[PDB]
Amino acid sequence: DMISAPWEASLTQAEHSLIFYFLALTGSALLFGLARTWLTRGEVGARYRTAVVARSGIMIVATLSYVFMVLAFTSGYDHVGSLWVPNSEAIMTIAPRYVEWSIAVPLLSIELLSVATLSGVSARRTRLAAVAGAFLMIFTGFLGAVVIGDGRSVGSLIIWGAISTVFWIITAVILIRAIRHSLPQLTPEAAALLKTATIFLMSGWAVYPLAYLIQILFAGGLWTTSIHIILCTADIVVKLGFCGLIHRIAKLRTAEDVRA
Amino acid sequence: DMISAPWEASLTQAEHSLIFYFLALTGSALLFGLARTWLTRGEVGARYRTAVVARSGIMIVATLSYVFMVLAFTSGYDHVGSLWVPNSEAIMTIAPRYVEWSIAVPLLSIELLSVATLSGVSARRTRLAAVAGAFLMIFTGFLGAVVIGDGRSVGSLIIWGAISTVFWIITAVILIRAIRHSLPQLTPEAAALLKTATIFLMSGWAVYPLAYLIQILFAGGLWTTSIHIILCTADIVVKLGFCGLIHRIAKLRTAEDVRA
Amino acid sequence: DMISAPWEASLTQAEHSLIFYFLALTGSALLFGLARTWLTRGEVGARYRTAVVARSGIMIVATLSYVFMVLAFTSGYDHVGSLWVPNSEAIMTIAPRYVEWSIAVPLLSIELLSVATLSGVSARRTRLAAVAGAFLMIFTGFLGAVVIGDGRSVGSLIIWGAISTVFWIITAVILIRAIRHSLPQLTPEAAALLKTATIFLMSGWAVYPLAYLIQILFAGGLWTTSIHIILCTADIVVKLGFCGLIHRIAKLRTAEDVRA
Amino acid sequence: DMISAPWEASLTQAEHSLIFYFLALTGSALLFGLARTWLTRGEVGARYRTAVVARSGIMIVATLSYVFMVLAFTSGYDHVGSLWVPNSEAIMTIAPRYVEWSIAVPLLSIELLSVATLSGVSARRTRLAAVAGAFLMIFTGFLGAVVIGDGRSVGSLIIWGAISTVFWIITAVILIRAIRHSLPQLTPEAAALLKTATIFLMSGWAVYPLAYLIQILFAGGLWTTSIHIILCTADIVVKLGFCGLIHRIAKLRTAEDVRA
Amino acid sequence: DMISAPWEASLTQAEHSLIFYFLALTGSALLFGLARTWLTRGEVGARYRTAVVARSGIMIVATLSYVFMVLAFTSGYDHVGSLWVPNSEAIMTIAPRYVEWSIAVPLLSIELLSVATLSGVSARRTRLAAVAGAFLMIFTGFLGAVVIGDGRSVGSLIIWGAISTVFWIITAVILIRAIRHSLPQLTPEAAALLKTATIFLMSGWAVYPLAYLIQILFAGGLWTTSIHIILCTADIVVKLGFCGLIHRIAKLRTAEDVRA
Ligand SMILES: *C/C=C(C)/C=C/C=C(C)/C=C/C1=C(C)CCCC1(C)C
Ligand SMILES: *C/C=C(C)/C=C/C=C(C)/C=C/C1=C(C)CCCC1(C)C
Ligand SMILES: *C/C=C(C)/C=C/C=C(C)/C=C/C1=C(C)CCCC1(C)C
Ligand SMILES: *C/C=C(C)/C=C/C=C(C)/C=C/C1=C(C)CCCC1(C)C
Ligand SMILES: *C/C=C(C)/C=C/C=C(C)/C=C/C1=C(C)CCCC1(C)C
């Protein structure tokens, strides 16, 4: 069949207000996350500096994405009466997220692995698989949702949703395997935290698919608003929550080593 | 009933001048506040680094908000004779404040708690309540004032004003409780300062509601000007004044620990 | 009576060239001043860090003001034949200075006081008076010159010129008093420098009123050009000259303390 | 003969989506590369600081280029029905790469040489030849592909392709010679890595010519998309991959010296 | 007589391509120069920190100038057939250089003097003369070439060319005198380098007048292209070459002092 695309829906003034607030709120929160990261980079040892590097990368990429989306949103809808009618630049209010996720879902994997205990081939092989898996999960989603069928084709969405979902599972398994192998070799406290971090990351990765279902199934202004609110909030929660948790695991691990 | 929205009023050239000066002055003052924060971050110990992190976050978010509002203001009113007539981008001269406050009212709570003495569950429980309470105070206000009724509906303003005000009290009580519990465990000097900081923060949070009353009751260019001047000044005073006070408390506390 | 405002005059191509060069030259010089400040912030002791903080603030605010004025100037005049005719954005080529001065005339006062010897109430009371006096000197000027009468009313200019001038004297007296009290307690060398710094600051503050007289008395393109050249040069000289002098005093004072 | 230029092709909405994603993804990845570089610059000794300087330069230049290309791309095609028709600014979506490569192909040469063992005239003479050779390889390509014939002339492309290719070989030989001379004087581990780095750099420099062949031979929207995807990916891989490898070599060399 | 100004010539697409590449290449190279400067500021002692300050200033000012010229160039010519016709904002593609040179020709003088041996009045008197001389050399050139006669008057160009040239000689003599006095008091190695630096700076200052001769004598698109290429290259060579040389002298002098 053929659903309308999420960036083709005219927005009521309320919906144009909500959609701006969450775009601006997310970009603001990610910029605070960047500043927190830089001000507290000294608390973590050089062994776990990959965490600092990843967290910074996630925040820098995500902050720019959300700046571009606020500017695209400002120039992507035109007021025509009581409604904001999408322009041609309206696709640049939702499509930039996939650019951000492409860099940030791989880095979140690397940031999780950084606190976990892995060495040699096992380390390298895990990282590459997790990066590769995560990137494809996102790129295949981008093809289905934006590129192929112009995001108006239900058939396309489903095929690439499935493909996307396969690469999710591949990627999830790899990260879950590695953490489980790494939990025994950690102090109880660390291993407790790293079990929580893994659950939080995987639970966060579960929300985003929901917003792809909206696109396959529902279509309208409220649904465009709901896709923004859902995805914006998920970013704020996952990117700020999980990255904080990993720094706690990494600060703890830093000290444990100093003890020894 | 139905009042006109604050961003729907045509401004006299005087009012368009005043409104710019205070938008630019506030953004300038907040940028100095950011630079002060970075140049003097070494005076505080790692125990109270949360203060540095919060203060930076408040200043970065607020500086961007006020940059966007000056640019929106520049492109949001069109001169038509002797008056500046608002465009559709004029709502982006007042609505960005709620994005800023959403991140900065929670952080001001965290910054106050950072100098106060609290630990364990009590700490976590207090912080989350204060963050959650503060965010809702702001978001409910944003719904009433901008999203619901397009900020033209007196009925909506009142309902969400009330709701907003409930979450204010919840949030205030939590912060006031915690400081009162924390005052005994501090040196007289510190506790003196932290009593002042609490009064200043709560007194500052009392001014902003005033500007919501203007919107419910009065409507016109002078009132749009008065809402900007009021809110801009309150930001400059609270954000620069209170954040300075907390660094003084945090610097003092840092030293006290050193002499122990 | 009535005079045309300084931003209502059509400019000859020569005058549009000169006026750009000095706007860009001043903003460039202030940006170098910022970089000098950051590269040489280590030469000053923590006792006089309120000089580094002030100097940075002056430079950051002034650099943004002059960026906005170059961009406003680029978009504020339209070429119509042989002359550049001012738009409605032309007022944003002169009005941003008052935003800059509002933050920078108070900070220059604080920066002077930082090297001088003041303690306790005397210190606090002096600083607040100097900040408050300096801000009102600028804001009252802004009312007379831009806000009240649209800067076309000779009567308004004179009233607020006078008011402005009252607050100048108040502010000057306070700063001059404090330095005179502080000169005896300093080493001869320092006190020599601090006497020069005070003269330079007060002499610099004398030039700016000249450009308000042009507005009261003369009107035309040559006069708009002369108001830019005068004010731009005064900024470059005062902001870069005086701030350098204070760092010399502050560096000297830092050493004196070390040798004790 | 004559071919349409790569920036003269109308793009399908899919192709306009793909082409944006890879422009934004590359600029995001290069910005992460910059942040990684600055967070990990302490791991390298002052002997090999040239590496840090080069890597930073590569990333700063490349990040700006790709920002300009995303903004040019946003303003360089106009939607006309089902297709995006190139404007006059469309040439600024492909031409900025040559500006980036002009600075970054020379620096990649310098970064390779920095870890290798070379001294005195031999060092200076090698660097200058490699810089000069690399710059001409790029500039001659820019003449053929953009400046001469407006990138529509097959004859021009071939002449400058050849010239370009001559300077490639000159440059390659010089870098390959120097590394071969340098491999014996390095520790086995280092020399292993530096052999890989040389292969990776030269292999990366082999991909870019492919995109020049497309231009000579094929012409159309899919080919414009294929030139972006090819060149964007090559940048991400070479700039992030090779620069990482050199830091590994540089970190290793740093330690080896510490041992001694 | 009368000649067309350099920014009044319509450019062929080739010439519009070349002129962009060199504007973007110069701005990119100056930004790398800034990053090099910051990454290697630790190699020089506090005695010669003026060098670091100058070099940074030169690079910051020049990088902004060339950003504002690439953006002016993008918005200063309109495609009209096969040619790019200059608009009104085309003078802002050549006039910003004089703003840059006004700050950077004085600083280059200060940077040369920083590594040379001068003290007391001789130092102060030399610096002020060199700064003053250099600024007037540039400003008088700006009057002749841009402001007076709109850069269309051969008579004006010649008068101010001559005046400009007088201040060049004054400035050159002062710098050459001081270096000659300073060469004896330096180690042979340092003095060798400082002799080269002086030749390089004065030789660089000789090229720029050539581009003023083009304007007096020749007029056309090729000549506009030749003025950009000449001036852009001269900036890249002088600003990056000379500033590097001075850091070498300054690093050497730093060490010499350490070994004493
Ligand atoms: C900071 C942003 C994060 C953590 C983003 C995560 C996004 C995903 C895990 C997306 C997953 C998807 C599927 C597995 C199926 C449908 C398409 C996607 C891309 C939304
Ligand atoms: C830096 C900005 C600060 C401290 C902002 C504070 C804002 C408030 C405390 C706002 C309170 C409100 C109410 C309790 C009722 C009406 C709606 C609000 C949001 C203005
Ligand atoms: C960095 C900028 C500085 C030091 C600006 C100083 C400006 C003044 C001292 C302005 C004084 C004025 C009067 C006392 C009367 C007329 C109005 C003013 C504001 C120009
Ligand atoms: C970071 C970017 C890099 C490493 C770019 C490298 C580009 C080249 C080695 C380009 C080579 C070319 C030829 C030898 C043939 C003609 C076309 C060129 C310029 C693409
Ligand atoms: C970084 C830029 C530099 C070193 C610029 C130097 C420019 C000059 C030395 C200009 C000299 C000129 C004359 C002496 C004659 C007339 C033309 C001028 C103004 C370009």
CATH assignment of the domain containing E59: 1.20.1070.10
Distance from C-alpha of D109 to C-alpha of D107, rounded to nearest angstrom: 5
Could you tell me if residue E2 is inside a domain? no
Which residues lie across from E184 on neighbouring strands? none
CA distance C127 to chain B (A): 15
- Rounded to whole angstroms, the Cα distance separating D225 from D15 reads 6
Query: For tokens 């106060």, what's the residue?
Result: B116
Q: Which ligand 4 atom minimizes the distance to the CA of D168?
A: 14
Instruction: Nearest chain A residue to B143 by CA: give it.
Output: A18
The closest of C225, C192, C200 to C211, measured between CA atoms, is C225
Alpha carbon of E43: minimum distance to chain D alpha carbons (Å): 9
Q: String of b and e for C53-82 (b: at least 16 CB within 10 Å)?
A: bbbbbbbbbbbbbbbbbbbbbbebbeeeee
* Beta carbons within 8 Å of B175's beta carbon, 6+ residues apart: B109, B112, B113, B130, B198, B201, B202
Nearest to A32 among B52, B61, B95 (CB): B61
How many angstroms separate the Cα of C31 from the Cα of each of C55, C251, E63? 12, 22, 12
Residue A88 CA to residue A65 CA, distance in Å, equals 18
Pairing of strands B11-12, B83-86: antiparallel
- Which residues, at least 6 apart from A63, have a Cβ–Cβ distance to it below 8 Å? A27, A30, A31, A33, A34
Burial of E176 (0-12, 13-18, 19+ CB in 10 A): middle
Rg (CA), chain A: 19
The shortest CB-CB distance from A61 to any of D18, D28, D39 is to: D28
The Cβ of residue B183 has, within 10 Å, a number of other Cβ atoms equal to 17
Q: Which residues contact C87 (CB under 8 A, 6 or more apart)?
A: C75, C76, C77, C78
Cα C227 from Cα B152, distance rounded (Å): 44
Considering only the beta carbons, identify the residue of E20, E36, E39 that sits closest to D95: E20
Which of D155, D207, D201 is CA-nearest to residue D176? Answer: D201
Are the C-beta atoms of residues B152 and B3 closer than 8 Å to each other?
yes
Chain D contact for E49, CB < 8 A?
Answer: no
Contact E26, E238 (CB under 8 A): no
In contact, B171 and B133? CB cutoff 8 Å = yes
Cβ proximity of B35 and C53 under 8 Å: yes
CB A34 within 8 A of CB A60: yes
Structure tokens at A40: 């507290």
Looking at the DSSP bridge assignments, the partners of residue C153 are: C2
Top residue of E11, E15, E18, E21 to mutate, by most chain D CBs within 10 Å, is E21
Give the integer Cα–Cα distance in Å for B249 and B251: 6
> C touches B (3+ CB pairs < 8 Å)?
yes
Q: What separation in Å is there between the alpha carbon of D137 and the centre of ligand 4?
A: 7
Reduced to 3 states (helix: H, G, I; strand: E, B; else coil), residue D183 is coil
CB C83 within 8 A of CB C11: yes
Residue E233, number of CB atoms within 10 A of its CB: 15
> CA–CA separation, A156 vs A135, rounded Å?
19
Name the closest ligand to CA D227: 4
| Pair B209, B230: CB distance under 8 Å | no
Q: D101, D140, D213: which to mutate for ligand 4, most atoms within 8 A of CB? A: D101
Residues 112-171 of B with CB under 8 A from A: 142, 146-148, 150
Chains that touch D (3 or more CB pairs under 8 A): A, E
Which residue of D63, D137, D243, D246 sits with most ligand 4 atoms within 8 Å of its CB, as the best mutation to test the pocket?
D137
Report in angstroms the alpha-carbon separations of B189 from A74, B112, B178, B185. 50, 16, 18, 12
Judge whether D86 and D76 are in contact, CB under 8 Å. Answer: yes
The ligand whose atoms approach the alpha carbon of E208 most closely is 5
Q: Show residues of chain D in contact with A141, CB under 8 Å.
A: none
Computed on alpha carbons and rounded to an integer, the radius of gyration of chain E in Å comes to 19
Report yes or no: B74 and B93 within 8 Å, Cβ to Cβ. Answer: no
3-state secondary structure of D83: strand
CA distance C7 to C86: 7
Please report which helix (H) or strand (E) contains residue B79, including its range. Answer: strand B77-80
The greatest distance separating any two alpha carbons of chain C, rounded to the nearest whole angstrom, comes to: 69
Q: What is the distance between the alpha carbons of residues D72 and D7, in angstroms, rounded to a whole number?
A: 12
Contacts (Cβ under 8 Å, ≥6 apart) of C78: C84, C85, C87
**Residue B105 is inside which H or E element, if any?**
helix B96-115
3-state secondary structure of D157: helix
Q: Contact, A75 vs A89, CB < 8 A?
A: yes
Cα atoms in the 13 Å half-sphere on the side-chain side of B81: 6
Q: Would you say residue E217 lies in a domain?
A: yes
Helices (H), chain E: 13-39, 49-74, 96-115, 120-142, 154-182, 188-217, 221-237, 243-258
List CB contacts (< 8 A) between D103 and chain E: 25, 28-29, 32
- The SS3 call for residue C11 is strand
Amino acid, single-letter form, for residue D236: I
Q: What are phi and psi of B53, to 5 degrees?
A: -70, -45
- Best residue for ligand 2 mutational test, from B131, B138, B169 (most atoms within 8 Å of Cβ): B138
Q: Which domain holds residue E195?
A: 11-258
Q: Which of B137, B167, B232 to mutate to test the pocket of ligand 2 (most atoms within 8 A of CB)?
A: B137
Cβ pair D18:A95 closer than 8 A:
no
Task: Say how far apart CA E246 and CA C134 lie, in whole Å.
Answer: 43
In order of A108, A112, B213, D37, D42, the CA distances from A50 in angstroms are 11, 10, 50, 12, 14
Q: How far apart are CA D101 and CA E28, in angstroms?
A: 11
A2 assigned to some structural domain: no
| DSSP 8-class letter at C84 | E
Chains C and A, touching by 3 or more CB pairs within 8 angstroms: no
In a domain, B215, yes or no: yes
What's the CA-to-centroid distance between B221 and ligand 3, angstroms? 29
**C74 and E89 in contact by Cβ < 8 A?**
yes
> What are the Cα distances from residue E176, in Å, to A194, E114, E170, E209?
67, 14, 10, 19
Let me know if residue E5 belongs to a domain. Answer: no
- Please, after which residues is chain D broken with C–N above 2.5 Å? none
Q: What is the DSSP letter of A257?
A: H
Q: Hey, what amino acid is at B68? A: F
Nearest by CB to D56, from E20, E24, E39: name it. E39
* Residue B25 to residue C57, Cβ atoms within 8 A: no
d(CA B195, CA B178): 11
Give CA separation, D22 vs A229, D16, D71, in Å. 26, 10, 13
Residue/partner pairs of A232-237 with CB below 8 Å, 24 or more apart: A232/A22, A232/A23, A232/A25, A232/A26, A233/A22, A233/A26, A234/A204, A234/A207, A234/A208, A235/A26, A235/A30, A235/A62, A235/A66, A236/A25, A236/A26, A236/A29, A236/A30, A237/A204
Helix (H) or strand (E) holding A56: helix A49-74
Mutate to test the interface with C, among B31, B39, B77, B79 (most CBs of C within 10 A): B39
Q: Which residues of A touch D43 (CB under 8 A)?
A: 46
Check: CB of residue A217 under 8 Å from CB of residue A81. no
Whether A3 is covered by a domain: the verdict is: no
Contact of E11 with E84, CB cutoff 8 Å: yes
Q: Which of C229, C212, C162 is nearest to C5 (CA)?
A: C212
- What gap in Å lies between CA C6 and CA C19, rounded to an integer? 13
| Residue D4 near residue D156 (C-beta atoms within 8 A) | no
| Residues in contact with D226: Cβ distance below 8 Å, sequence separation at least 6, in sequence order | D211, D214
Would you state the structure tokens that stand for residue C260, as one six-digit string?
Answer: 């004790």
Residue B173 in contact with partner chain C when CB distance is under 8 A: no
Listed residue (D49, D140, D68, D52) closest to D102, CA to CA: D140
Q: E strand or H helix at C85, and its extent? A: strand C83-86
The whole-angstrom distance between residue B257's C-alpha and the CA centroid of its chain comes to 31
**Alpha-carbon span A253 to D59, nearest angstrom:** 32
| Tokens coding E152 | 């269309």
Query: Assign residue C11 a region: left if phi > 0, alpha if psi is -120 to 50, beta otherwise?
Result: beta
Interior CA angle at C72 toward C68 and C78, to 5°?
165
User: Are E92 and C20 in contact (CB < 8 Å)?
Assistant: yes
CA distance E104 to C67: 19
Length of chain A: 260
Query: Contacts from D143-148 at CB under 8 Å and sequence distance 24+?
Result: D144/D212, D145/D98, D145/D212, D145/D215, D146/D91, D146/D94, D146/D95, D146/D98, D146/E17, D147/E14, D147/E17, D147/E18, D147/E21, D148/E14
Separation in Å, CA of D119 to nearest CA in chain E: 16
List the helix and strand counts (H, then E) for chain D. 8, 3
**Backbone phi, psi, residue C45, to 5°:** -75, 160
E195 touches chain D (CB under 8 A): no
Minimum-distance ligand 2 atom for the alpha carbon of B145: 17
Q: What is the DSSP letter of E150?
A: T
* Chain C residues touching residue E52 (CB < 8 angstroms): 39
State whether E40 and D57 contact (CB < 8 Å). no
Chain E residues in contact with D148 by the CB 8 A cut-off are 14
- Give the number of C-alpha atoms closer than 13 A to the C-alpha of residue E147, restricted to the C-beta side: 22
Under 8 Å CB pairs connecting chains B and C tally to 58
One-letter identity of residue B157:
L
Q: Would A233 be classed as within a structural domain? A: yes
The answer to whether residue E87 sits within a structural domain is yes
Q: Are C73 and C97 in contact (CB under 8 A)?
A: no
Handedness of CA E240, E243, E248, E251 (dihedral sign): negative
Q: Give, as one character, the DSSP assignment of residue B153.
A: B
**C-beta atoms surrounding B252 within 10 Å:** 19
Return the H-helix or E-strand segment holding A11: strand A11-12
Nearest of D118, D111, D137, D135 to residue D241 by alpha carbon: D111
For ligand 3, the distance from its centroid to the CA atom of residue C258, given in whole angstroms, is: 37
Q: Are the beta carbons of B104 and B240 closer than 8 angstroms?
A: no
Question: Is A95 strand, coil or helix?
Answer: coil
Distance CA E125, CA B58 (A): 47
Kind plus residue range of the DSSP H or E element containing A196:
helix A188-217
Q: Which of A19, A32, A84, A85 should be substituted to probe chain B, the one whose Cβ sees the most B Cβ atoms within 10 Å?
A: A32
Q: How many CA atoms lie within 13 A of B78 on its CB side?
A: 4
Residue B189: CB atoms within 10 Å: 12
Cα distance between the two ends of chain B:
63
Q: How many domains does chain E have?
A: 1
Residue D2, burial from CB neighbour count under 10 angstroms (0-12, 13-18, 19+): exposed
Q: Give the dihedral of Cα atoms D249, D254, D256, D260; nearest 10 deg.
A: 160
Task: Mark E84-118 as b/e (b = at least 16 C-beta within 10 Å).
Answer: bebeebbbbbbbbbbbbbbbbbbbbbbbbbbbbbb
What the block records as the tokens of C125 is 């009371």
- Judged by CB atoms closer than 8 Å, whether chains meet at D103 and E43 is answered as no
- Resolution of the structure in the document, Å: 2.9
Q: Tell which of A59, A147, A153 to mutate to test the D interface (max D CBs under 10 Å).
A: A147
Look at the block and give the residue holding tokens 């330096």.
Answer: E186
Residue with tokens 């901008």: B146
Q: Whose alpha carbon is nearest atom 14 of ligand 3? A: C165
From the CA of E231, how far away is ligand 5's center (Å)?
A: 9
d(CA A67, CA A23): 8
Q: State in Å: Cα E216 to ligand 5 middle.
A: 15
Strand ranges of the sheet holding B11-12, from the earlier edge strand across to the other edge:
B11-12, B83-86, B77-80
State in Å: Cα B16 to ligand 2 middle: 24
| Residue E78 DSSP SS3 | strand
> Sign of the CA dihedral B182, B184, B186, B192?
positive
Which residues touch B246 (CB under 8 Å, ≥6 apart)? B51, B55, B111, B112, B114, B115, B197
Burial code (b: 16+ CB inside 10 Å, e: under 16) for D44-63 equals bbeebbbbbbbbbbbbbbbb
The partner residue sitting opposite B35, judged by closest CB among C57, C99, C150, is C57
- One-letter amino acid for residue A124 of the chain: R
By the 8 A CB rule, do A7 and A94 touch?
A: yes
Does the CA dihedral D100-D105-D110-D111 come out positive or negative?
A: positive
Mutating to test ligand 1, I would choose from A138, A170, A200 the residue with most ligand atoms within 8 A of its C-beta, which is: A138
Pick from C81, C108, C58: which is nearest to C10 by CA? C81
Strand D11-12 and strand D77-80: the pairing is unpaired
From the CB coordinates, do chains A and B have 3 or more pairs under 8 Å? yes
Query: What CA–CA distance (Å, rounded) separates B66 from E177?
Result: 52
Of C110, C106, C93, the residue nearest C138 (C-alpha) = C106
- State the method: cryo-EM
E13/D99 CB distance under 8 A: no
Distance CA D90, CA D151 (A): 13
- The C-alpha atoms of residue D146 and residue C4 are separated, in whole angstroms, by 51
**Residues shown for chain D:** 260
Q: Does B49 touch chain A (CB under 8 A)?
A: yes
